[PDB]
Amino acid sequence: IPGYDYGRVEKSPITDLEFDLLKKTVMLGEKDVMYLKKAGDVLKDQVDEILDLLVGLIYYFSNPDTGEPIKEYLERVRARFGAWILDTTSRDYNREWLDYQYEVGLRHHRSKKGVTDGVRTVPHIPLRYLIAQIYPLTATIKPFLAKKPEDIEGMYNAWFKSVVLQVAIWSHPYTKENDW
Amino acid sequence: IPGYDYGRVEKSPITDLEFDLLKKTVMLGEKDVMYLKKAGDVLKDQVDEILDLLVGWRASNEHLIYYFSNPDTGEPIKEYLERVRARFGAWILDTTSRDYNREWLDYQYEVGLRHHRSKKGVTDGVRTVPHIPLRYLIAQIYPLTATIKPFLAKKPEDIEGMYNAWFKSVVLQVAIWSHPYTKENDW
Amino acid sequence: IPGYDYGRVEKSPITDLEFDLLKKTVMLGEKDVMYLKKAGDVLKDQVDEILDLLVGWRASNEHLIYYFSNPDTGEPIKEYLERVRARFGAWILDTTSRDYNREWLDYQYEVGLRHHRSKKGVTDGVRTVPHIPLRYLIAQIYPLTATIKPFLAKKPEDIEGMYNAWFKSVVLQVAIWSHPYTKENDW
Amino acid sequence: IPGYDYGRVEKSPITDLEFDLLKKTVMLGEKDVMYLKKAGDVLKDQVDEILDLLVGWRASNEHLIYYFSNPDTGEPIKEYLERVRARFGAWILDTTSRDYNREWLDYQYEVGLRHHRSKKGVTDGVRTVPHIPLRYLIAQIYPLTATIKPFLAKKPEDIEGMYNAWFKSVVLQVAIWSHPYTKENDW
Ligand code: HEM
Ligand code: HEM
Ligand code: HEM
Ligand code: HEM
Ligand SMILES: [Fe+3]
Ligand SMILES: [Fe+3]
Ligand SMILES: [Fe+3]
Ligand SMILES: [Fe+3]
Numbered sequence: 001i002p003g004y005d006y007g008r009v010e011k012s013p014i015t016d017l018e019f020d021l022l023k024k025t026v027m028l029g030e031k032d033v034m035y036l037k038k039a040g041d042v043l044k045d046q047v048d049e050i051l052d053l054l055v056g057l058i059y060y061f062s063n064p065d066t067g068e069p070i071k072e073y074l075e076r077v078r079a080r081f082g083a084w085i086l087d088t089t090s091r092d093y094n095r096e097w098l099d100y101q102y103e104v105g106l107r108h109h110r111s112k113k114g115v116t117d118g119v120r121t122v123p124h125i126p127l128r129y130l131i132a133q134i135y136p137l138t139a140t141i142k143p144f145l146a147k148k149p150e151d152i153e154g155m156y157n158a159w160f161k162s163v164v165l166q167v168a169i170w171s172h173p174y175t176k177e178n179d180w
Numbered sequence: 181i182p183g184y185d186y187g188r189v190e191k192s193p194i195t196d197l198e199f200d201l202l203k204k205t206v207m208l209g210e211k212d213v214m215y216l217k218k219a220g221d222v223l224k225d226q227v228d229e230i231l232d233l234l235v236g237w238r239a240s241n242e243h244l245i246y247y248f249s250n251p252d253t254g255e256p257i258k259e260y261l262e263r264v265r266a267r268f269g270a271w272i273l274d275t276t277s278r279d280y281n282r283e284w285l286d287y288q289y290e291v292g293l294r295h296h297r298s299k300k301g302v303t304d305g306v307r308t309v310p311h312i313p314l315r316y317l318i319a320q321i322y323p324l325t326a327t328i329k330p331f332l333a334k335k336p337e338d339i340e341g342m343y344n345a346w347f348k349s350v351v352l353q354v355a356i357w358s359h360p361y362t363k364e365n366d367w
Numbered sequence: 368i369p370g371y372d373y374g375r376v377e378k379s380p381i382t383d384l385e386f387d388l389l390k391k392t393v394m395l396g397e398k399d400v401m402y403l404k405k406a407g408d409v410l411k412d413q414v415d416e417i418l419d420l421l422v423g424w425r426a427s428n429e430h431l432i433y434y435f436s437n438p439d440t441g442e443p444i445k446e447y448l449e450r451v452r453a454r455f456g457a458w459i460l461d462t463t464s465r466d467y468n469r470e471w472l473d474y475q476y477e478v479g480l481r482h483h484r485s486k487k488g489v490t491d492g493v494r495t496v497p498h499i500p501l502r503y504l505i506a507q508i509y510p511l512t513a514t515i516k517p518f519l520a521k522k523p524e525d526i527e528g529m530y531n532a533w534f535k536s537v538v539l540q541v542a543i544w545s546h547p548y549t550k551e552n553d554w
Numbered sequence: 555i556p557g558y559d560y561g562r563v564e565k566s567p568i569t570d571l572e573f574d575l576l577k578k579t580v581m582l583g584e585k586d587v588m589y590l591k592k593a594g595d596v597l598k599d600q601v602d603e604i605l606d607l608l609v610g611w612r613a614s615n616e617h618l619i620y621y622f623s624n625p626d627t628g629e630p631i632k633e634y635l636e637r638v639r640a641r642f643g644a645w646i647l648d649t650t651s652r653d654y655n656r657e658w659l660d661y662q663y664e665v666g667l668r669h670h671r672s673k674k675g676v677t678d679g680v681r682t683v684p685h686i687p688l689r690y691l692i693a694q695i696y697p698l699t700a701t702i703k704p705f706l707a708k709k710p711e712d713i714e715g716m717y718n719a720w721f722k723s724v725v726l727q728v729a730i731w732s733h734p735y736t737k738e739n740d741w
Contacts, residue, residue, distance in 0.1 A: 007561075010252050010307035015299070102307075172305065177182055198502075204430070205506035207513075243391060296553070314549045315385075318542040319392035321508060322535050326394075348509050355505040358545065362501045366483070366548040377626050377681035382673070476681075546679070551556055 003116035004080045005103060006087055011095075012102030014172060019098050022168055026161040028093065035158035039145055040089030042155065046144050047082045053140055055081050057129065064122045073119045088162050098169065105130075105170025127174040130167055138163045183303035184267045185290060186274055191282075192289030194359060199285050202355055206348040208280065215345035219332055220276030222342065226331050227269045233327055235265040244316065251309045260306045275349050285356065292317075292357025314361040317354055325350045370490035371454045372477060373461055378469075379476030381546060386472050389542055393535040395467065402532035406519055407463030409529065413518050414456045420514055422455050424448040431503065438496045447493045462536050472543065479504075479544025501548040504541055512537045557677035558641045559664060560648055565656075566663030568733060573659050576729055580722040582654065589719035593706055594650030596716065600705050601643045607701055609639040616697075618690065625683045634680045649723050659730065666691075666731025688735040691728055699724045 043050065055078040062069045084104070091097045106112040110124035138160045145155045172180045223230065232239050237258045241248065248264065249256045271291070278284045293299040297311035325347045332342045359367045410417065420427055424445040428435070435451065436443045458478070465471045480486040484498035512534045519529045546554045597604065606613050611632045622638065623630045645665070652658045667673040671685035699721045706716045733741045 008252070010250055011301065011310045013301045013305045013307060015302060177305070201430075202502060202506055205503055206509040243388070311553065314545050314554050315389060315542045316392055318505060318508075318545055319389055319538060322393045322531075322538045326531060326534070344509075344513060347513070351506060351509045355502045358501050358505055358548075361545075361549050361553040363548060363550055366498065367501050375626075377624055378675065378684045380675045380679045380681060382676060551679070 001079045004083050006100045007096050009099050009103040012099045026165045028161040032158040035154040036089045039155040042145055042148050047085050051078050051082050060122045060125050070119050073117050076117045101166045101169045109173045111173055134163050134167050181266045184270050186287045187283050189286050189290040192286045206352045208348040212345040215341040216276045219342040227272050231265050231269050235268050237261045247309045247312050257306050260304050263304045288353045288356045296360045298360055321350050321354050368453045371457050373474045374470050376473050376477040379473045393539045395535040399532040402528040403463045406529040409519055409522050414459050418452050418456050422452040434496045434499050444493050447491050450491045475540045475543045483547045485547055508537050508541050555640045558644050560661045561657050563660050563664040566660045580726045582722040586719040589715040590650045593716040596706055596709050601646050605639050605643050609642050611635045621683045621686050631680050634678050637678045662727045662730045670734045672734055695724050695728050
């Protein structure tokens with residue numbers, strides 16, 4: 001998967017304790033981790049159905065000067081998104097994970113958006129939209145989790161925690177130097 | 181100066197007596213303190229010349245530009261070099277002009293952490309080489325001591341007193357820095 | 368000289384390139400090597416005077432006599448001081464006259480181990496303070512560099528070249544020594 | 555596992571086609587790959603039993619304890635044996651379960667370097683026999699292939715397929731390892 005760089009990115013400038021504390025704040029414990037892995041079992045063969053709901057805000061996949069969406073941008077991102085679905089549910093949330101989530105935040109940010117796919121695109125995804133997205137990208141997943149309640153709630157709250165945690169990480173390049 | 185946190189950092193886990201003893205081991209007495217202050221007078225307007233020798237985007241960075249680089253591409257990070265250089269310029273005057281008290285100790289410890297995987301890159305939010313090996317921190321004692329001497333002389337006992345004081349300080353600092361690098365009980 | 372094992376020790380777990388790079392970092396070039404050899408000429412007959420300043424049961428030892436002492440009584444161990452002093456006298460000339468090759472590196476590593484809890488006291492079969500904290504090894508860089516300079520001058524560019532070479536060597540050595548003191552991946 | 559660096563080592567200077575051709579020569583095809591994975595299932599919970607046959611402070615020893623020893627005293631280094639044994643336990647499962655891709659190749663090369671004077675002893679910071687002669691690396695192919703077979707059988711075509719796959723892998727690995735041992739153009 002072109003651009004998919006999980007495990008092959010630089011060290012994010014977020015300490016391991018800050019990360020620990022962030023997971024503590026979203027309440028992502030050992031129960032979540034197992035809920036996440038279970039969800040990975042459940043989402044597993046539903047990824048293309050999930051993708052068809054989400055990717056493949058079209059504006060942010062577009063050329064800004066013409067407003068035309070960039071097929072290959074949509075294509076390549078969708079594949080990395082499909083993998084992120086399973087990275088979210090199945091990776092251990094360790095430094096390697098943290099470092100990729102940071103990368104992914106940079107790729108929404110003017111710092112690296114468009115660079116991974118060599119496209120000429122909308123340079124930057126405003127933070128306000130990254131945070132708003134927390135809701136649709138959390139709630140979209142739940143029917144998927146249920147297609148195969150406590151179970152479903154545990155998986156679904158774990159997904160929720162992860163999406164929040166990720167966006168919390170992503171905010172760091174968007175935030176004023178000392179405000180994150 | 182972004183990141184420059186002198187006087188605003190947590191307490192280093194080195195006691196005041198350990199610090200006292202460290203200063204006695206490098207032989208940093210009242211004479212040094214005054215030599216240091218005089219050096220502060222002398223270095224004062226030479227800081228950019230000093231910086232151009234040591235750090236910055238367009239400065240001689242021999243073999244250790246890598247540690248200002250992105251590790252995966254090896255490309256130096258301009259702003260990292262920029263922001264560090266400014267804090268380094270201030271450190272030149274912190275070294276010569278601060279009283280070497282708990283506040284100083286606490287900053288030197290911070291500075292050691294910022295070379296260490298504990299906090300390197302965090303202050304400037306950069307994605308960089310995570311860690312500066314201790315071996316290089318100690319080796320650096322020589323170039324960062326000897327580089328300063330022509331500066332001290334540009335405007336002998338005097339110069340030697342200033343220069344030995346600088347030497348003691350650089351050593352003392354690196355001695356402090358080693359603490360996060362050392363095995364739990366070996367420091 | 369009992370315990371003096373130059374050229375007779377195991378291979379240090381530091382690569383030849385790491386060593387090369389370390390010498391590059393302290394800036395120890397061909398000029399230094401010759402400065403060192405000249406210093407060997409100059410220090411040559413001053414070794415006992417040097418020793419009386421630094422080590423020996425009847426020396427001007429500082430509070431670091433403790434590290435030559437029995438820890439439970441605090442009594443200095445004459446023979447420990449005696450035997451170490453002799454090896455130190457030889458180290459003075461090893462520093463100035465040996466080629467800084469793998470054989471040298473391997474001895475400097477040994478010497479660092481002998482300050483470390485790994486082998487301190489073993490060479491002289493003494494029951495002594497088990498370990499010399501790294502902080503003190505690094506602080507020592509200053510007194511063991513600066514002590515030598517009057518010696519170099521007793522017989523300026525010359526003296527500075529010899530003296531900076533000695534400085535580089537002391538730093539380089541302590542940089543090597545730090546390896547057994549450092550956390551597995553921090554050196 | 556300290557030192558265990560699978561997936562974290564530099565690029566081996568062996569091309570992807572040379573590697574492809576090497577796998578072709580040992581006849582390691584898709585059948586082997588699956589045999590290997592099946593062996594991973596089977597060896598799985600037998601690793602400590604395998605280890606006790608091959609490596610460790612108190613493992614049935616050949617006359618190659620020497621290579622885990624201090625060369626000057628001939629004393630085996632417990633922690634060296636300990637740390638290597640753990641990485642060996644992982645190698646058992648790396649051999650059976652990793653895809654034999656560039657990442658794998660790069661680790662096998664690393665592992666060959668760690669037998670070679672290039673890096674032996676460096677990973678565990680030990681002072682040890684500097685180098686494992688190539689002749690012994692190749693001879694080892696037999697015991698490290700044949701030792702595994704009872705393990706594979708404890709749970710024939712199956713067993714032969716797993717066992718020949720293991721054989722191919724051990725050979726392939728040693729073939730890779732030979733590169734740092736070989737004269738510049740002879741590999
Ligand atoms: C309005 C909000 C969002 C917009 C407009 C948006 C748009 C985009 C765009 C344009 C890319 C490709 C960026 C590039 O690499 O150049 C991307 C990548 C990606 N986005 Fe979003 N995104 C939003 C929110 C989110 C959220 C909340 C998540 C998940 C927590 C997310 C997950 C991903 C993933 C997983 C990738 C691919 C990451 C990779 O490169 O592996 N996005 N998104
Ligand atoms: C005697 C040895 C050294 C001295 C006195 C020294 C001095 C300094 C100072 C004063 C700073 C900024 C402190 C602050 O942020 O408040 C700094 C940061 C830094 N120096 Fe050094 N330095 C030494 C060794 C080294 C070495 C060996 C390297 C290798 C490249 C290095 C590279 C860096 C880097 C990358 C930073 C930024 C660290 C960070 O991410 O915060 N320095 N140094
Ligand atoms: C506070 C720091 C130090 C103290 C307290 C100290 C004390 C000692 C002691 C007790 C020994 C013998 C240890 C043993 O083998 O059991 C020793 C050995 C020695 N030390 Fe130090 N030392 C210090 C730092 C240094 C430094 C910085 C140098 C030179 C760079 C140095 C040079 C030597 C030499 C040459 C020997 C004998 C090495 C040999 O056995 O051949 N020491 N020192
Ligand atoms: C006479 C031949 C051999 C001897 C004496 C020997 C001994 C050793 C020694 C001393 C080490 C640690 C080296 C270091 O310092 O890094 C080691 C590591 C290792 N050996 Fe061997 N070895 C031999 C051949 C082989 C063979 C044929 C294999 C299997 C293909 C093998 C598998 C391993 C593994 C997997 C490790 C650890 C790799 C790692 O660090 O991840 N060795 N062996
Ligand atoms: Fe930050
Ligand atoms: Fe401590
Ligand atoms: Fe090491
Ligand atoms: Fe070759």
